[PDB]
Ligand binder design. Structure first.
Ligand SMILES: CCCCCCCCCCCC(=O)SCCNC(=O)CCNC(=O)[C@H](O)C(C)(C)COP(=O)(O)O
Lengths: 546, 125, 82, 64, 144, 85, 77, 107, 88, 117, 108, 443
């Protein structure tokens, strides 16, 4: 039951991409993918139950070593702890519904089976990454999910914008991966082994934490690395949902939680800055997908702050990930359903009424919005309040800035989420498309997401939920009031006169433009200078005419 | 609804630039440069000078509270000491440099504990 | 096709497209339709979420109306310390 | 040309001169990139400088 | 959906694309190319030899790493008790500390000296006098 | 800390090992943590009901500990002179 | 040892960790070659230099510009 | 029309009739809207292979499982694995293979 | 269906006529196929621009600026639509 | 200010494109079409206050000021229909252009498919 | 439409076939003269070098400057590695006679 | 030796074949290269890793010509003997068969040489062969052959006085006695550095390769890419470190800085390339510089890591050349702007292009990834700054790689259809070898 959690999606994806798929068709490919996802999900549920509740960690010898030269020893070995069990359970539960939705959304796509196979590869490599006991397998999972994301974003190879976005994201993640590789070099040189269980550190040389955090921020799309995330909406809805729910974006935070070898000051500063930037970004746009992506970034920043707080903060951050994934995927899927009912319209300004879409999709979007904004007694409510309370008691004076920033960010989160729902349904109709699709499978996927959200409340992620921390009565009620304020302001749907601030905010602070010409055009010029001026010039040896 | 008709990119008919290897022509109109914003217009017609001018104040406005709180207020601001643990238990927990228990100003070796907590970068021989 | 048909030019609305199954406004007709499985599943999920929130709140209402400080100091003063 | 009346003709011409960047701006941004993306070099070198300053002060005081 | 159901009859018979561009002609079986048998024979023979090398050559013959595991296991076993006794004899530990100070070593290199009793520089310095004579005694009583 | 010394530990190292307690929770309320963990990690869905007393006891012990920490901070400030005495 | 101990690893598998780090150091630094700098997995040279610098600065009657030496940096040393 | 076209299958009913896709390309996955005739029998055979590989990896997983510590309570892994050590509770009392308190302290 | 991505002449004509009559100055009986905007219907340049935008909304089209400038009569717009494979 | 091509437009056409693009931008800054209606009425009225202008200098002044206002207000995220230029659904999956096929190339001219030297 | 084969294989060259025979050159592109001129110029860009102001400035500040930077960095890394292994000053190329290759038989 | 002479005479029988029976000509030409592959397999089965660091020793009297086998030479021989049959599969003339047979003989003889004079003599005996290969009348460039031949001759002429001086100094030319005598390490060291910095592409004297490897046909391109650069690395490992260590030490900063600047400038220069073949040409420079730095590091396991990287490049890069050659031959041009929509046109070929692109970019499940990990382990142990410099610019190579791949593969379909059975077979050995060495290279 243990190795079923990893090998089964991989085998399913291999079959879906094998020449065997020629003899099956899209019907058969969908059947195979759904069956593989369900079986892996059952295995993951069993493993989660046993590990979390009965505390049984199991280590696996899989393929022997991978390579052992010198004191460096690398082995195909898998270990399942509480962290690995949580990650596997979350990823499988997300990706099962993601596959269910993708089996219906792209029904009129020509090459559906390739899409299914790449999704299965993405899920399997995520399972590989989380199953890692040593850092090399973590790297393998990192690059495998990167490759799968590259293929999935560039699925529609006929649109240049998607190709540009994929290449940009790949290069940014490769910068992060070089930083991570340098950190791995340092970790092995100063610790002599790669298994996380053999990594217990009290005070490193600083570069360890710095480089590891930079590499993690690369995957988590934090400050100075978030630009790629918005452009990823060029890909199909299932890819964005899977990436933003439980994979890729989660991997950096997962590595940080597994390691717990960071530096609190830099972690807190980066997380707070990224959260504030994501919050101000999400309320200032009109593309539906970009807002949800920026919300993903904001929750990533929340988790960063939590893990920077401490070990308890790290576990709370892991629980925040576990609760965030479900409703993030739910929001993505509901947005995709509404968009398809809107004739592919991906802009908010042409929506309205209760005629374009089904009742279940509307209710699912409502529930996901309520959970994400921290509505009292809900899934995101518990994790967000726990992180806030643990951040309202930190011993770092730096954290005081972070607490205020996160309060503002949560208020803005409620603001733009309520604006999203308001523009989706509450406003009058202002588009031209009504094709309400009421197919069983995506509705069932939404149902599974909502059931998992219910479980996350009826059953806590860890023992932290319910652990009461002693705050003044106003302090606890503060995020509730902030969400109420966001509700009021968004239901007013009002705006300001300071239009220069508006044009600045909408531009995403010009970060893409800044990176367009500070490093990039100079890289191009350095390349031309090197080649032409040196090789054909200074390094050139001409001909002796005669 | 695949199969929408798409305009093609007609082949060039005049001498190419020396550095033409920055325009991305995928065969369909419209093409794009190697990267967005690299040359030509920007959405909103803003310029780099505009954003540099704005950031010249926005960055310091964001950074100012960090420096003020890190340079004018200490652990005495919190009305409680960190979570207490027995000596044989605390003695390992505080060994971590990232560990927050170092900020107990009531610690018997408080200044010494903070002394060990500084961060180095080059390993010393 | 489109769930909304547009008539234009004040054309006589098709007789086949009239009845309880068709509701017209500004010359444009929309259909009154009901889906059984969709509505039933929506009701089930909504009821589940509502009951979840209600019961979780009722189990933890005192820890919200008064503060944890207030509630636990009240318990200590009134119901002992050990 | 059969789709120009639907998605635009080739009348409009791109306003790009294909020219190398400004020398001073290129130099300044190259230095900015080098500083941002080679910080460990400076950190190690400054560590060595602080270490040798400590040794110099020790040598100055220890021989008197 | 064809037939109005997801469980309807198929629609495709014939050849779906041409692999390699090889097209059947008059039902005649495809001609084998001139190079195919020799290529297959040579490359399959190399692969078979590779598998037989990796799965039939003696472990010592295949790689050195197998030759040293049984020989190092016993040395580790007999040095573990030496280390443990060094945890029980402060006099021997401080003698080894003095030896390490004599040998450009720091206080923390105590266990390093224990594990290197079979090293080239150690024995050569023992023979030439660079190593203190007392190191031999330390090894002798720790083995005891 | 002398004015408000910690109470004796009712949980031994062996008991915490048997309960598999995370080491950063080995506080002056360890036994309450252990009992809460043992109760909740066995109840299934209805953990908030059949383990309410355990949670309340653990939170009460933590309330005592938090009061002790606040009092220690106040006494330290008074000694150093940060608060009028 | 690590997987048998579980949570109690911070007071139960110290000595075996020290043994393993010592073995790694012996494997690396002995016959290290002509160009490779010396390696301390347990940061032993770092903290010993730290203690010597602390003592020297104490004799120097000036404020320490370096972190105070640590008792141990890893789960082993 | 070329000779080899007669060996080629037509465009599938799933495919949009207004689309042309150069049907002659051999694709690794099947191509465009691929939907063979005997597809359900192929699907059943594929599921059979899936189940066989599932059984093989199930056997290997049960074979190579290493449990370094007793679990905290009853688990379903017992019913198919005997290498699983007998559980030990939070209080350290050893428990039977059914995960219940033994006699003397039970009931 | 009908048309290689194109709709019928007749529904296009009917939709264009139905859009056309949305002006206070306009008498209904004078709107007909291939009708002059300025000379016949007496609509200013602002009215022509508004009609272009309204037809763009009705047929879901993003007309290029030059083609829009070419539009000056009912028949021209109808024939332009009769050239569009992108009109709904 | 407009672009050089727009600078070449006739006065009537220049003002027409100005008004059209202004309506486009007002949609782009609009929360909804319903919000856009009164803005559309006001924008139509404002031009109505300039209908009877004759002095070309003041006409050019008004036109230039309006062009500068519009240029300052280029929307960063325009509202586009999905299947047009710049839209998200544009250039997703086109029909395959005709590509010739070469049957049994290896079968032709065997033993002589290498490289000249 | 040609017949480059017989009903039983036997590739026919079809020298005297009216139809155009499918061959290796079948899918060759039609070259664009401007593209050909551009590619010749870029493959023969060597004739465009000149000691102008810009070229010299760029060559000194970047090429030689970063050569010097990497050289000094290598020297620093080498000396620091020497100091981190307990070795005295070592003789680099042109550094006066000094210690080279620390003996394996000496503890440093 | 006897077996080797039998193969030498058996290979020469190609010319004696009358040209009338083309079928047998191809069969004989292919089988002549097939045999040494099995012979090297038999050698590997015969080797003992528990034996001496050198095995299968043989000396031809006082005629120098000392032949012995280490792991590096055996692995290089295996990789070359895998490569050569694919090159034979891409030729159509007897002259090409003879030239490549002589080239393979020379490479094999040099790969296990143990005499420095012997290496000098045997290595550059193929320079005229390369000259005739590259500058072929209908499609080659005479300038590229002129360049490469002059560079190689300059290196050899610089080295020769050092070789004869150390010969006179120690009275012989065998490595195992050259390594044991006191010598003026400096002069011989300069000679060795010059030759093996010309052979391996190192800045500044590296400019022959971009023209040469592009002007040559597919078979010669693969040969030059996967073999002659590794003659430099095995040259270092077999000669320079065992003979003159002090020069190696005192030059280490120079070698390191030269390798670093070579890697940086080559990586930056590649993005401005406008032809796929030139892009592939610049790609190998970074790999060779990394190999050289790994060799010169000598930290923990430098020789093994360098050998792993050499094998990885000699495996992956020839696949890039195979794809380039297929595209050019079935397209008649190498210019990028004529490549588009290749995935829909060449599905399996484009998939292989993707896979081998990732192979060039050091991704997991590939031997290049482990190779660069080991090389960076060796570099890091010496110092962390060099390792960071290698680590930081990893993005810059993948930049041009992905840009070129996406530009030529995605977009408007235009160009050739997918690959043929022969082309897939030529691709096959590299894919299987890369998978095998990226999953379980060792056991
Ligand atoms: C966000 C908003 C930004 C600002 C947007 C711009 C707002 C400023 C608008 C105010 C300035 C003007 O109206 S611009 C001034 C426009 N009016 C004139 O120039 C005088 C009339 N001249 C003529 O040639 C024709 O009557 C003409 C009416 C042009 C054509 O109508 P027809 O062809 O039917 O005949």
């Amino acid at each position: 039951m243990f190795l079923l959690s990893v090998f089964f999606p991989l085998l399913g994806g291999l079959v879906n991409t094998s020449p065997i798929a020629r003899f099956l068709g899209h019907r058969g490919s969908s059947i195979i993918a759904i069956g593989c996802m369900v079986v892996a999900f059952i295995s993951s549920v069993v493993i989660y139950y046993e590990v979390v509740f009965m505390g049984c960690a199991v280590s696996v010898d899989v393929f022997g070593t991978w390579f052992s030269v010198g004191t460096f020893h690398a082995g195909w070995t898998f270990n399942f702890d509480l962290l690995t069990a949580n990650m596997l359970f979350t990823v499988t539960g997300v990706s099962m519904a993601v596959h269910m939705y993708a089996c219906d959304y792209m029904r009129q796509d020509p090459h559906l089976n390739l899409f299914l196979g790449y999704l299965s590869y993405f899920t399997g490599f995520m399972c590989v990454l989380v199953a890692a006991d040593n850092l090399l397998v973590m790297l393998v999972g990192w690059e495998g999910i990167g490759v799968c994301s590259y293929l999935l974003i560039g699925y529609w190879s006929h649109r240049l914008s998607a190709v540009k976005s994929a290449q940009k994201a790949i290069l940014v993640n490769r910068v992060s991966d070089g930083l991570l590789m340098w950190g791995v070099l340092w970790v092995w040189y100063h610790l002599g082994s790669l298994e996380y269980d053999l990594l217990n550190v009290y005070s490193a040389s600083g570069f360890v934490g710095l480089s590891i955090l930079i590499g993690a921020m690369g995957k988590s799309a934090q400050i100075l690395f978030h630009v790629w995330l918005a452009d990823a909406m060029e890909g199909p809805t299932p890819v964005s949902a899977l990436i933003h729910a439980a994979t890729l974006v989660t991997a950096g935070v997962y590595l940080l939680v597994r390691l717990h070898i960071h530096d609190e000051m830099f972690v807190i500063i980066v997380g707070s800055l990224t959260a504030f930037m994501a919050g101000v970004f999400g309320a200032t746009q009109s593309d539906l997908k970009r807002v949800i992506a920026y919300s993903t970034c904001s929750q990533l920043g929340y988790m960063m702050v939590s893990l920077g707080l401490g070990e308890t903060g790290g576990e709370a951050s892991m629980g925040h990930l576990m609760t965030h994934a479900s409703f993030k995927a739910a929001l993505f899927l509901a947005a995709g359903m509404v968009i398809s009912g809107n004739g592919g319209n991906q802009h908010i300004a042409r929506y309205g009424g209760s005629a374009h879409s089904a009742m279940f999709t509307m209710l699912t979007l409502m529930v996901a919005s309520l959970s994400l904004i921290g509505w009292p007694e809900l899934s995101g409510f518990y994790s967000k309040e726990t992180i806030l309370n643990l951040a309202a008691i930190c011993a770092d004076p730096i954290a005081d800035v972070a607490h205020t920033l996160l309060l503002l960010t949560a208020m803005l989160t409620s603001a733009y989420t309520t604006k999203l729902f308001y523009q989706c349904f509450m406003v009058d109709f202002s588009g031209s498309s009504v094709t309400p699709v009421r197919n069983v499978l995506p509705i069932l996927a939404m149902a599974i997401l909502l059931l998992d959200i219910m479980l996350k409340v009826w059953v806590g992620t860890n023992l932290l939920s319910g652990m009461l921390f002693f705050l003044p009565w106003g302090v606890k009620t503060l995020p509730f009031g902030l969400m109420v304020a966001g509700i009021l302001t968004a239901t007013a749907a009002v705006g300001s006169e300071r239009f220069t601030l508006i044009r600045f905010c909408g531009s995403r602070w010009g970060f893409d433009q800044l990176f367009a010409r500070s490093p990039v055009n100079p890289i191009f010029d350095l390349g031309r200078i090197t080649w032409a001026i040196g090789d054909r010039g200074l390094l050139s040896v001409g001909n002796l005419r005669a | 609804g695949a199969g929408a008709p798409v305009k093609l990119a007609p082949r060039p008919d005049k001498p190419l630039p020396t550095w033409y290897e920055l325009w991305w022509d995928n065969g369909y109109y419209p093409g794009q440069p190697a990267a967005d914003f690299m040359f030509g217009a920007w959405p909103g017609n803003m310029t780099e000078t505009y954003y540099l001018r704005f950031w010249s104040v926005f960055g310091l406005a964001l950074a100012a509270p960090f420096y003020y709180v890190a340079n004018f207020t200490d652990e005495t601001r919190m009305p409680m000491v960190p979570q207490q643990y027995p000596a044989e238990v605390r003695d390992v927990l505080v060994q971590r440099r990232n560990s927050m228990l170092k900020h107990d100003f009531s610690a018997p070796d408080f200044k010494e504990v903070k002394d060990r907590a500084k961060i180095y970068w080059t390993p010393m021989y | 096709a489109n769930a909304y048909h547009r008539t234009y030019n004040g054309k006589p609305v098709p007789p086949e497209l009239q009845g309880a199954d068709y509701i017209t406004y500004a010359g444009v007709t929309m259909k009154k339709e009901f889906h059984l499985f969709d509505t039933v599943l929506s009701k089930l999920i909504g009821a589940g979420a509502t009951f979840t929130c209600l019961y979780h709140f009722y189990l933890n209402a005192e820890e919200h109306w008064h503060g944890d400080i207030y509630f636990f100091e009240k318990d200590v003063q009134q119901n002992g310390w050990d | 040309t059969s789709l120009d009346h639907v998605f635009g003709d080739n009348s409009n011409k791109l306003n790009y001169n294909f020219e190398p960047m400004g020398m001073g701006s290129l130099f300044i941004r190259t230095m900015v990139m080098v500083g941002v993306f080679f910080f460990p070099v400076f950190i190690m070198i400054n560590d060595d400088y602080k270490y040798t300053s400590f040794l110099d002060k020790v040598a100055a005081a220890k021989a008197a | 959906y064809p037939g109005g159901s997801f469980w309807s009859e198929g629609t495709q018979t014939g050849k779906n694309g041409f692999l390699f561009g090889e097209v059947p002609i008059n039902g005649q079986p495809r001609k084998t190319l001139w190079w195919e048998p020799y290529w297959y024979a040579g490359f399959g023979g190399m692969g078979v030899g590779v598998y037989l090398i990796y799965h039939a050559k003696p472990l010592e013959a295949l790689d050195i790493k197998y030759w040293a595991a049984p020989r190092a296991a016993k040395e580790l076993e007999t040095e573990m008790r030496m280390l443990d006794k060094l945890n029980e004899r402060p006099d021997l530990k401080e003698r080894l500390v003095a030896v390490c100070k004599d040998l450009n070593m720091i206080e923390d290199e105590a266990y390093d000296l224990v594990l290197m009793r079979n090293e080239y520089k150690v024995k050569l310095g023992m023979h030439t006098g660079r190593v203190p004579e007392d190191l031999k005694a330390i090894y002798e009583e720790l083995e005891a | 800390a002398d004015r408000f010394p910690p109470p004796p530990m009712k949980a031994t190292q062996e008991q915490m090992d048997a309960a598999d307690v995370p080491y950063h929770y080995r506080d002056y309320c360890a036994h309450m943590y252990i009992d809460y963990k043992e109760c909740r990690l066995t109840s299934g869905f209805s953990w908030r009901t059949k383990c309410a007393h355990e949670l309340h006891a653990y939170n009460k012990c933590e309330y005592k500990e938090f009061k002790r920490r606040v009092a220690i901070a106040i006494e330290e400030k008074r000694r150093r002179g940060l608060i009028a005495a | 040892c690590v997987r048998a101990a579980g949570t109690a690893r911070y007071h139960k598998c110290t000595e075996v960790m020290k043994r393993l780090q010592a073995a790694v150091r012996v494997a690396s630094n002995v016959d290290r070659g002509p160009l490779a700098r010396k390696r301390d997995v347990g940061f032993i040279y770092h903290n010993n230099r730290l203690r010597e610098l602390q003592q020297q600065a104490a004799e120097l009657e000036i404020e320490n510009p370096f972190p105070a030496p640590a008792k141990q940096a890893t789960g082993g040393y | 029309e070329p000779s080899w076209a007669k060996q080629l299958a037509p465009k599938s009913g799933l495919c949009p009739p207004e689309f042309h896709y150069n049907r002659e390309i051999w694709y690794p996955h099947g191509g465009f809207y691929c939907d063979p005739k005997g597809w359900r029998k192929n699907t059943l055979l594929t599921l059979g292979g899936i189940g066989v590989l599932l059984y093989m990896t199930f056997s290997y997983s049960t074979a190579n499982e290493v449990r370094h510590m007793p679990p905290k309570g009853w688990i379903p892994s017992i019913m198919w694995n005997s290498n699983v050590p007998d559980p030990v509770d939070f209080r350290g009392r050893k428990l039977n293979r059914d995960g219940t308190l033994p006699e003397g302290e039970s009931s | 269906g009908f048309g290689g991505g194109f709709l019928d002449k007749d529904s296009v004509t009917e939709r264009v006529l139905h859009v056309t009559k949305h002006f206070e100055k306009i008498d209904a009986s004078k709107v007909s196929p291939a009708a002059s905007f300025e000379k016949d219907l007496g609509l200013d340049s602002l009215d022509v621009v508004e009609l272009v935008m309204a037809l763009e909304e009705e047929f879901g089209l993003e007309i290029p600026d030059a083609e829009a400038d070419k539009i000056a009569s009912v028949g021209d717009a109808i024939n332009y639509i009769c050239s569009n494979p992108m009109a709904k | 200010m407009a672009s050089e091509v727009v600078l070449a437009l006739p006065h009537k056409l220049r003002v027409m494109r100005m008004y059209r693009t202004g309506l486009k931008e007002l949609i782009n800054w609009s929360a909804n079409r319903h919000e856009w209606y009164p803005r559309a009425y006001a924008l139509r009225q404002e031009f109505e206050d300039s209908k009877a202008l004759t002095d070309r200098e003041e006409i050019r002044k008004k036109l230039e000021h309006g062009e500068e206002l519009l240029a300052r207000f280029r929307h960063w995220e325009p509202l586009i229909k999905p299947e047009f230029v710049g839209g998200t659904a544009y250039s997703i999956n086109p029909a395959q252009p005709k590509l010739k096929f070469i049957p049994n190339y290896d079968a032709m001219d065997e033993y002589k498919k290498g490289d000249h030297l | 439409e040609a017949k480059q084969f017989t009903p039983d294989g036997k590739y026919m060259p079809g020298i005297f076939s009216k139809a155009k025979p499918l061959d290796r050159s079948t899918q060759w592109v039609h070259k664009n003269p401007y593209i050909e001129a551009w590619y010749y110029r870029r493959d023969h860009f060597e004739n465009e070098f000149v000691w102008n102001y810009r070229t010299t400035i760029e060559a000194l500040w970047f090429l030689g400057g970063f050569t010097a930077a990497a050289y000094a960095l290598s020297v620093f890394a080498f000396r620091q590695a020497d100091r981190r292994s307990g070795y005295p000053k070592r003789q680099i190329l042109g550094d006066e006679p000094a210690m080279v290759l620390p003996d394996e038989r000496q503890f440093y | 030796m006897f077996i080797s002479v039998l193969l030498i005479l058996f290979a020469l029988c190609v010319t004696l074949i009358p040209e009338a029976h083309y079928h047998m000509v191809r069969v004989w030409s292919f089988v002549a290269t097939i045999i040494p592959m099995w012979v090297v397999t038999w050698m590997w089965w015969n080797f003992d890793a528990s034996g001496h660091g050198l095995q299968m020793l043989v000396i031809l009297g006082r005629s120098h010509l000392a032949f012995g086998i280490d792991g590096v030479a055996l692995s290089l021989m295996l990789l070359t003997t895998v490569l050569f049959p694919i090159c034979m599969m891409l030729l159509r003339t007897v002259a090409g068969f003879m030239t490549f047979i002589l080239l393979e003989v020379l490479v094999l003889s040099a790969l296990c040489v143990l005499d420095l004079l012997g290496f000098y003599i045997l290595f550059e005996a193929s320079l005229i062969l390369l000259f005739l290969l590259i500058g072929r009348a209908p499609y080659g460039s005479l300038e590229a052959a002129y360049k490469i031949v002059l560079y190689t001759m300059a290196g050899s002429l610089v080295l020769l006085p050092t070789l004869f001086m150390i010969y006179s100094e120690c009275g012989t030319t065998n490595v195992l006695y050259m390594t044991c005598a006191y010598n003026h390490q400096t002069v011989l060291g300069w000679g060795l550095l010059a030759v093996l910095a010309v052979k391996i592409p190192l800045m500044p004297v590296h400019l022959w390769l971009p023209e040469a490897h592009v002007a040559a046909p597919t078979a010669g391109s693969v040969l030059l890419a996967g073999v002659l650069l590794k003659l430099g690395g095995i040259g270092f490992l077999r000669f320079m470190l065992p003979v003159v260590p002090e020069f190696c030490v005192s030059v280490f900063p120079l070698v390191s800085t030269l390798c670093l600047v070579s890697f940086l400038f080559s990586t930056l220069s590649t993005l401005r390339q406008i032809d796929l073949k030139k892009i592939v040409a610049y790609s190998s420079i970074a790999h060779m510089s990394m190999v050289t730095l790994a060799i010169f590091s000598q930290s923990e396991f430098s020789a093994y890591s360098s050998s792993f990287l050499m094998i990885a490049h000699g495996l992956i890069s020839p696949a890039l050349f195979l794809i380039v050659g297929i595209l050019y031959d079935r397209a008649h041009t190498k210019f990028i702007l004529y490549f588009s929509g290749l995935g829909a046109s060449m599905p399996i070929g484009s998939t292989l292009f993707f896979l081998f692109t990732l192979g060039n970019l050091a991704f997991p499940l590939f031997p290049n990834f482990i190779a660069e990990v080991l090389c960076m382990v060796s570099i890091f142990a010496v110092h962390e700054l060099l390792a960071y410099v290698f680590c930081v610019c990893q993005v810059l190579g993948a930049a041009y790689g992905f840009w070129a791949f996406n530009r030529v593969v995605h977009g408007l379909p235009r160009g050739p259809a997918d690959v043929t059975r022969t082309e897939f077979h030529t691709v096959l050995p590299l894919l299987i070898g890369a998978v095998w060495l990226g999953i379980k290279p060792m056991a």
